[PDB]
């Protein structure tokens, strides 16, 4: 599309998220969600093909249903208390419907079904934006009303999200579906600490955002969307495959990498409130995410797959467009474990 139009749409998405974040009125939060949804669709349909249109319409359906449920919860909360301010929810299942609407917006289980579909349909840049920036507003709203959640429902949905992401990532060959299931699992990890510490939720969100940005921008640099297509990258850019494998190891939660920091902290926080069984189950389930990350690493850098004759020509050319923030993203997603106590900055 026109670069001016694309810039305007991106700024409108950001402005909707910011309106959700800075407002104290429920109607304004709903308006910000509506603005973000309105400006998001053409970004998902930049490259015109039937798959992109299908993904966009699925995303629109899910987000519109979530917005209607959110407004319904707001209306019930207003009925049982003449309050518009975003505070304690003041009521039963009105809060349940608010939690369900925010879970559908975030993609938490059992409302996770749209994430792999939309991520596979859209391109890599649209997937990057969808899996990174579209989590800030619902997570902020959840953090604001985190004193109101029913811990049983939130913890059940978080555990279901972790289990579903771990199990669904095992069966995937397409990279975008792998990213979607990884996002589902990481959201499950994020929302299981909301009742206890929102600071840990924000730290996990920051780490996941950095790691996902590095992952998606590496995938964009080596333009592959499939496991076998990614298996050809070693014959042109071995350093990209090595950085990709290190990033994948970080995403698996392996110490001393950065991806270990959130889970660790979360587990610690969870043991401060006499919760022992659920952190253990969460770690045993994250082992599955680690397994399919390790399989991708095997196919990517640790082994040399067969190539094609035409690749020789690609040896004579260089990438014209370069991402400036990729080295910083890789370093941040890999080597900031020693700086853990800085989480006191209430990130």
């Amino acid at each position: 599309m026109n670069p001016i139009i694309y810039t305007t749409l991106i700024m409108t998405v950001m402005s909707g998220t910011m309106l959700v974040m800075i407002s104290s009125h429920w109607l304004l939060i709903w308006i910000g969600f509506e603005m973000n949804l309105l400006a998001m669709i053409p970004v998902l349909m930049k490259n015109f093909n039937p798959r992109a249109t299908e993904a966009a319409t699925k995303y629109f359906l899910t987000q519109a249903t979530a917005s209607m449920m959110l407004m319904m919860a707001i209306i019930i909360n207003l009925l049982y208390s003449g309050q518009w301010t975003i505070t304690k929810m003041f009521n039963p299942v009105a809060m349940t419907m608010m939690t369900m609407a925010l879970a559908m917006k975030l993609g938490l289980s059992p409302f996770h079904f749209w994430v792999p579909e939309v991520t596979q349909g859209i391109s890599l840049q649209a997937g990057l934006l969808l899996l990174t920036w579209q989590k800030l507003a619902p997570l902020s709203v959840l953090c604001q009303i985190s004193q109101s959640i029913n811990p049983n429902l939130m913890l059940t949905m978080a555990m279901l999200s972790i289990l579903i992401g771990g199990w669904g990532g095992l069966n995937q060959t397409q990279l975008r579906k792998i990213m979607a299931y990884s996002s589902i699992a990481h959201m499950g990890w994020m929302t299981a600490v909301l009742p206890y510490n929102t600071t840990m939720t924000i730290l996990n969100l920051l780490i996941y955002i950095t790691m996902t940005l590095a992952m998606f921008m590496l995938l964009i640099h080596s333009s592959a969307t499939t496991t076998l297509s990614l298996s050809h990258t070693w014959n042109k850019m071995p350093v990209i495959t090595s950085l990709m494998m290190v990033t994948l190891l970080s995403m698996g939660g392996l110490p001393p990498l950065s991806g270990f920091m959130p889970k660790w902290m979360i587990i610690q926080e969870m043991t401060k409130n006499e919760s022992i069984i659920m952190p253990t189950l969460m770690a045993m389930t994250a082992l599955l995410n680690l397994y399919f990350y390790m399989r991708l690493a095997y196919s990517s850098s640790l082994t040399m797959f067969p190539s094609t004759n035409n690749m020789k020509m690609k040896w004579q050319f260089e990438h014209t467009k370069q991402m400036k923030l990729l080295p910083t993203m890789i370093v941040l997603s890999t080597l900031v474990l020693p700086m853990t106590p800085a989480l006191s900055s209430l990130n």
């Binding site: 109607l27 309105l38 319409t57 209306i75 579909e117």
Partner: protein
């Protein structure tokens, strides 16, 4: 909590269930969304008028406006989907599978 509010919430729940059944005709999904919107408008209007929240009289109109815009967007999407297949059948969108 009176009975008219219960009836309106029951209408909202029925519209949501109809949206979630998905027999065919994505247009029916859009219709269910608009029915849920109408229920929300009616009940918010009743709550605001009953308690004489004078300023909150802005809220219904706004809602309406925004939601109607959503409908337009949805309609547009439907057209493009039809422009690929000629019909708005739900089962035609099976190219993506989890």
């Amino acid at each position: 909590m009176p009975l008219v509010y219960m009836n309106i919430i029951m209408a909202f729940a029925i519209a949501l269930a109809g949206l979630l059944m998905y027999r065919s005709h994505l247009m029916s999904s859009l219709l269910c969304l608009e029915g849920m919107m109408l229920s929300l408008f009616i009940m918010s209007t009743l709550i605001i008028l009953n308690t004489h929240f004078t300023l909150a009289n802005m809220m219904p109109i706004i809602l309406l406006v925004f939601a109607a815009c959503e409908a337009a967007l949805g309609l547009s999407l439907l057209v493009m989907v039809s422009n690929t297949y000629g019909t708005d059948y739900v089962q035609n969108l099976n190219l993506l599978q989890c």
